[PDB]
Each structure stands twice: as C-alpha cells, then as structure tokens.
Amino acid sequence: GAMSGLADKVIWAVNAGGESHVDVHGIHYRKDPLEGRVGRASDYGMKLPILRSNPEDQVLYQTERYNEDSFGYDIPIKEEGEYVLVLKFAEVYFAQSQQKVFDVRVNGHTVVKDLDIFDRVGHSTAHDEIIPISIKKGKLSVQGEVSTFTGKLSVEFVKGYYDNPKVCALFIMKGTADDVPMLQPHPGLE
Ligand SMILES: OC[C@H]1O[C@H](O[C@@H]2[C@@H](O)[C@@H](O)O[C@H](CO)[C@H]2O)[C@H](O)[C@@H](O)[C@@H]1O
Fold it and tell me: Of 17, 76, 140, 156, which residue has the fewest beta carbons closer than 10 angstroms?
C-alpha cells in the first residue's frame, strides 16, 4: 500500500549498521556507501531492539557500523527548498552521562556539539535530531548562519571520547519538516 507522501520527497538516506533498508513511510537507506564503500553489515549489535521503533524501522534506526574516526557522509544536491536532516542515533556502550559527548556538522556546520546519546534519552531506545535548513539561489542557511552550498551536503562527526557514534540512521528529505508524519496518541478503539 501507499498513503503517506514522505517517500515522495526523500532524496538520500543512510543507516550505518545495516544494509539497504526501506522504512515503513518508504525511506530507503543505501548500503554502506562511506565505510570503505565495500563490504556487508557486520550485524554484531543487532541485538537490543530499539523500543521507540517498529520492528522494520527498528533494524534501520538500529544496527551498527564502525569506521575509525571522523566519519563523513556526502549528499549531492541539485535542488532548493527547505531541506530537513533527520537522523536516528542509538547505542554507545557504557551507561554514563555527560562523558560520551561528540560533534556533529552539516555541510561543515556544527549543530550538535555535545552528542551524548545516553544523557539525551537514557536507555538504548531511539535518539533523534531534527535540523531544518533553507537553500535558495544555490546558497545554504543553517539555523542562524549563512554559507553558500558547494556540490553536496556533508555530515561529519568528530570523535569525542573513543568509539565514534555507534549507530547511525542518516535520513535526508527535501522541502520541509512539516511533511514528517506525526500521529498524536489516540485512545479508544480506532
Ligand atoms: O569489532 C566489534 C566492535 O569493536 C569495537 O568495540 C570495542 C568493544 O568490543 C570492546 O572490546 O571494548 C572496546 C573499548 O571501548 C571497544 O572499542 C567498535 O567500537 C564497535 O563498533 C564494534 O562493533
């Protein structure tokens, strides 16, 4: 079936950990394209199913891939509008707070410099960061800083305290954050 219209705006998505997956809404991740761009999901930490995610979008929002340090993703763009970078981060090993902090940049712009997945949600579960963007005339505007766009969007995260962001669920869509379906809890019988 097909009702939602999210897949209609998708343009590029990557979940470091699994291998080519399509979330319910219809958001597909393209197999390890930056981790040596060669190999297959090691699926070593497939265990511990994320709670805030349905079984299918679970393996996606979950799974884990390890590179080495300062991992970098490339998102070639050729259109404008409101680009919304949504990503699901999960797991990090060791139950500690304000210690395992990392850095996250968009097209070279630090938006979350203190990514402590644990302190953020707590238990494993699923973590999510929403970063709306505005590209016009070929230029880029991140939050409150202006910088022209050049070839592609680059999400680079730098090491903070060993073990770079374990689980990565990169998901980039185009045109707006409002599209992102969100059904508020409903009681009774549907
Ligand atoms: O190859 C499996 C995992 O290796 C690394 O994790 C290490 C862990 O297994 C243990 O031995 O402790 C060390 C020190 O912190 C960890 O580095 C990778 O970080 C992980 O991504 C792999 O799945």
Answer: 76
Measure the CA–CA gap between 149 and 1, rounded to whole angstroms: 37
104 alpha carbon, distance to own chain's centre: 11
Structure tokens at 19: 């291998």
Count of other CB atoms within 10 angstroms of residue 29? 24
Q: Ligand 1 pocket, 43 CB below 6 A?
A: no
Please tell me if the CB atom of residue 162 comes closer than 6 angstroms to any atom of ligand 1: yes
Query: Which among 66, 167, 168 is the best mutation to test ligand 1's pocket, defined by most ligand atoms within 8 Å of the CB?
Result: 66
For the chain, what is the largest distance between any 2 Cα atoms, rounded to a whole number of angstroms? 51
Query: Does the beta carbon of 94 sit less than 6 angstroms from any atom of ligand 1?
Result: no
Name the residue with the closest Cα to ligand 1, atom 9.
Answer: 93
